[PDB]
Amino acid sequence: MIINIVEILIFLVCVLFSVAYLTVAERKTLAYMQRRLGPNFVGYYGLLQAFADAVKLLLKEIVIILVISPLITLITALIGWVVIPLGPGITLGELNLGILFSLAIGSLGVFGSLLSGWSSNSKYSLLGSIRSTAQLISYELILTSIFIIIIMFVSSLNITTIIETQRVVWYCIPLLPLLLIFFIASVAETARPPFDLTESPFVFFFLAEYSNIILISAFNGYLLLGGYLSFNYSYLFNILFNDYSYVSFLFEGLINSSAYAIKLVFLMFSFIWVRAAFPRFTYDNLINFCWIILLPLLFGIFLIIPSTLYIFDSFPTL
């Protein structure tokens, strides 16, 4: 009732804020990469940039379908925020099949790229929308296949089960090549420019772009890196607190969300950092990179993992 509407209020309002401060963070850090001031400031007054240009963006011209694809792109980008946990067992909705949901919504996210090319059509513009679609699905493959080879060690579709399994060691440090290829497949889902031929109502694509940026950052953070995990912290508490109290649960939820947010913030900074340094791809190079060279390595990593679980006892129990 009131108990949960205040809860979803706090979460929606925090995620809606953080996606808007990313649009400022990208301008600032790319300014200082190239030795410019960029935007004047970043504070509480700092939203009034991203607010002000988000207002003025609704003042240009456009030239029933045109209504629907920005809408479904933004709501597909926004519903995937429940299923990330922010701390142990803290989800906005708890479901045992969270990866199946996360995966189905990475599948739903492709439709706005199709239906955007129909509006104000030309022959060549329609072909360009086809190319953006096909690269989006092509890297969605390797996205899904590595989700499998992560949950081979878990053998559970629950997400807090993954992170509590991850307590002994993160999955990023055995499977470090997997981190590398996920980071590039993660800037492949999105149109980040090493991977951006096919770019080089608009407010919804603009918002949902950065929402997908920070949401695939979340999808990295829980399954490859430690989700909310930083260290053990069993010993520090026995000196600070005497007993469980609302101050103690506050302090632990605080440090867990800090450990999650530092993963998400470093990864998010690395997206903007890989934006600046590199030129973009020919589309033939993009498809060739996805299929001919990276995905045979993906079948190879897929065969070498269960065999390694086979050589020892080491099958994971549900």
Partner 1 sequence: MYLTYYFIEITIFLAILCTIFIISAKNPMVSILYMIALFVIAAMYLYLIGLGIFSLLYIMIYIGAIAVLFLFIITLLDINSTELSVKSNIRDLPLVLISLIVLTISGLMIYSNDSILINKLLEAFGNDYNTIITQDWFNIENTTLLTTIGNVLLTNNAFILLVLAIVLLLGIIGPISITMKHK
Partner 2 sequence: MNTFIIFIILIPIVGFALLAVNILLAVYKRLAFNAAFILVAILFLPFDLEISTLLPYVMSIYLVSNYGFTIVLLFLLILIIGFVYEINTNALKINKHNKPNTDSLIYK
Partner 3 sequence: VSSSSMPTDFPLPSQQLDAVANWARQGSFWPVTFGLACCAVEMMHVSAPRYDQDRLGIIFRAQSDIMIVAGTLTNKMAPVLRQVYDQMPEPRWVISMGSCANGGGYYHFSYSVVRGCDRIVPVDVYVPGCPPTSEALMYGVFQLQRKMRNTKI
Length of the chain: 318
Of the candidates 81, 30, 80, 7, the one whose C-alpha atom is nearest the C-alpha of residue 274 is: 30
Binding segment toward partner 2, per CB under 8 A, in 4-12, 41-49, 191-199, 252-260: 4-12
Site for partner 3 in 26-45 (CB under 8 A): 31, 34-40
114: contact with partner 1 by CB under 8 A:
yes
Residue closer to partner 2, measured from CB, 31 or 75 = 75
Neighbours of 224 (CB within 10 A): 24
Residues of span 44-83 touching partner 2 by CB under 8 A: 58-63, 67, 70-71, 74-75, 78-79, 81-82
The long-range contacts involving 131-135, CB below 8 angstroms and separated by at least 24 positions, are 131/197, 131/198, 131/283, 132/191, 132/198, 132/199, 134/287, 135/188, 135/195, 135/197, 135/198, 135/283, 135/286, 135/287, 135/290
* 160 binds partner 1, rule: CB under 8 A: no
Q: Tell me the window of 104-112, 192-200, 241-249, 258-266 that interacts with partner 1 (CB under 8 A).
A: 104-112
Nearer to ligand 3PE, 101 or 153 (CB): 101
Restricting to residues 52-81, name those near partner 3 by CB under 8 A. Answer: 52-53, 55-56, 58-61
Least distance in angstroms from the C-beta of 84 to ligand 3PE: 15
Give the binding-site size for partner 2 (rule: CB under 8 A). Answer: 65
Residue 2, H or E segment: helix 2-33
Nearest approach in angstroms of CB 270 to ligand 3PE is: 5
**In this structure, which amino acid lies at residue 310?**
Y
Distance of alpha carbon 59 from alpha carbon 47, whole angstroms: 19
Helix or strand (DSSP H, E) at 8: helix 2-33
Sign of CA dihedral 260, 227, 13, 32: positive
Asked if residue 93 binds ligand 3PE (CB under 6 A), the reply is yes
Out of 32, 51, 118, 291, name the contact with partner 1 by CB under 8 A: 118
What residues from 272 to 311 belong to the interface with partner 1 (CB under 8 A)?
A: none
Three-state secondary-structure class, residue 89: coil
SS3 85: coil
* 217 in Cβ contact with 18 (< 8 Å): no
- The C-alpha atoms of residue 203 and residue 11 are separated, in whole angstroms, by 22
34: Cα within 13 Å, side-chain hemisphere: 12
Count of residues in contact with ligand 3PE, rule CB under 6 A: 19
Binding site for ligand 3PE (CB under 6 A): 93-97, 101, 177, 180-181, 183-184, 194, 270, 274, 285, 289, 293-294, 297
Binding site for partner 2 (CB under 8 A): 1, 4-5, 7-8, 12, 58-63, 67, 70-71, 74-75, 78-79, 81-82, 92-95, 123-124, 127, 130-131, 133-134, 137-138, 140-141, 144-145, 148, 151-152, 155-157, 201, 203-204, 207, 284, 287-288, 291-292, 296, 299, 302-303, 306-307, 309-310, 315-318
Binding site for partner 1 (CB under 8 A): 65, 68, 95-97, 100-101, 103-105, 107-108, 110-111, 114-115, 117-118, 126-127, 129-130, 133-134, 137, 157, 318
